[PDB]
Design an enzyme around this catalytic site. Structure first.
Site, PDB file in Angstrom:
ATOM      1  N   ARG A 133       8.528   3.549  -1.909  1.00 32.90           N
ATOM      2  CA  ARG A 133       9.828   3.475  -2.553  1.00 32.90           C
ATOM      3  C   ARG A 133      10.859   4.413  -1.923  1.00 32.90           C
ATOM      4  O   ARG A 133      12.058   4.210  -2.145  1.00 32.90           O
ATOM      5  CB  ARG A 133       9.713   3.782  -4.056  1.00 32.90           C
ATOM      6  CG  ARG A 133       9.260   5.186  -4.355  1.00 32.90           C
ATOM      7  CD  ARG A 133       9.278   5.506  -5.863  1.00 32.90           C
ATOM      8  NE  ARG A 133       9.286   6.946  -6.126  1.00 32.90           N
ATOM      9  CZ  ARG A 133       8.216   7.734  -6.171  1.00 32.90           C
ATOM     10  NH1 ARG A 133       6.999   7.270  -5.942  1.00 32.90           N
ATOM     11  NH2 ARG A 133       8.374   9.023  -6.462  1.00 32.90           N
ATOM     12  N   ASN A 134      10.428   5.394  -1.131  1.00 36.82           N
ATOM     13  CA  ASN A 134      11.322   6.327  -0.455  1.00 36.82           C
ATOM     14  C   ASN A 134      11.460   6.039   1.030  1.00 36.82           C
ATOM     15  O   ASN A 134      11.881   6.931   1.778  1.00 36.82           O
ATOM     16  CB  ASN A 134      10.861   7.758  -0.683  1.00 36.82           C
ATOM     17  CG  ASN A 134      11.303   8.293  -2.012  1.00 36.82           C
ATOM     18  OD1 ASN A 134      12.398   8.006  -2.477  1.00 36.82           O
ATOM     19  ND2 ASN A 134      10.435   9.064  -2.649  1.00 36.82           N
TER      20      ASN A 134
END
Ligand code: QU6
Length: 267
Positions: A133-134
């Site tokens: 997600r990053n």
């Protein structure tokens, strides 16, 4: 960092929330950009953290790390402005593209993430929140390590237990990211609760192989999950292995056995 004048920035849509502000897609004088603001009323600590973030981001110059376009610090609201990646975050990207890539493409994304992490670790920057997600994905499938802010099931045991965050705990997280990529964005440990995950790890269990996963890739992710931090590969080792596997791509044709969770019997 480069200081950008506010007349050069056009905010267009909200795409997220910051610690004391919002995150927008917009245009920079036009190139698309992402824009994080620090809104009126921010505290001293928030200002220190925000400009500190801008300052560290300005030091990052690597193909696999998000690029800072510049900062607005001389006018209010203050802003951090980065390049914009139209394919978005890697976790959502892969879940929307299930089964669409070759093994070599997937392993190439991992090599890039690893190269970005080797750069950060070498710079003595501990990420602490490495997860798909990053990671942002550009239109050439290049992965850019980023950090959008707040992850038990991505975190190494020593970091959970006693707050020991180092490059070696980032290596644990990298192993989880490898599993996320090779599964097209499955949730690590599926429905297990955070406490059940920690108990499983402590009992010695580890995530099983993804489907269609090269043996070498599963072996590598497994060594990222050694309980003893000193036994894990360094990022230099990870990059080297991934590079060699890609450069001799027949090495990736040997697959780890996938453990069936369901039996289908047919004649
Ligand atoms: C090791 O790398 C480090 C270490 C420490 C700090 C950071 N900081 C950033 O990573 C950061 C800071 C500010 C900005 C404007 C960006 N850009 C984007 N943030 C978001 C987004 C979405 C939702 C909610 N929040 C954010 N989405 C984006 C971009 C670009 N393209 N897209 C689609 C990223 C990176």
């Amino acid at each position: 960092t480069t200081e950008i004048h506010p007349s050069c920035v056009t905010r267009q849509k909200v795409i997220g929330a910051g610690e004391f502000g919002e995150v927008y897609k917009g245009m920079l004088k036009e190139v698309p950009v992402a824009i994080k603001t620090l809104k009126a009323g921010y505290t001293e600590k928030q200002r220190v953290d925000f400009l500190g973030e801008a300052g560290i981001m300005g030091q990052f110059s690597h193909h696999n790390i998000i690029r800072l376009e510049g900062v607005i610090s001389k006018y209010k609201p203050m802003m951090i402005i980065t390049e914009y990646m139209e394919n978005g975050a890697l976790d959502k990207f892969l879940r929307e593209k299930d089964g669409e890539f070759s093994v070599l493409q997937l392993v190439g994304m991992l090599r890039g993430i690893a190269a970005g992490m080797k750069y950060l670790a070498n710079m003595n920057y501990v990420h602490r929140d490495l997860a798909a997600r990053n990671i942002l994905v550009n239109s050439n499938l290049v992965c850019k390590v980023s950090d959008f802010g707040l992850p038990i099931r991505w975190t190494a045991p020593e970091a959970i237990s006693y707050r020991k965050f180092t490059s070696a705990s980032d290596v644990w997280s990298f192993g989880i990211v490898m599993w996320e990529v090779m599964t097209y964005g499955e949730r690590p440990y599926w429905e297990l609760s955070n406490h059940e995950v920690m108990k499983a790890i402590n009992d010695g269990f580890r995530l099983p192989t993804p489907m269609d996963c090269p043996s070498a890739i599963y072996q590598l992710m497994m060594q990222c999950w050694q309980q003893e931090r000193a036994r894990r590969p360094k990022f230099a080792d990870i990059v080297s292995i991934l590079d060699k596997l890609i450069r001799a791509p027949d090495s990736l044709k040997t697959l780890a056995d996938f453990d069936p969770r369901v039996s289908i019997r047919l004649p």
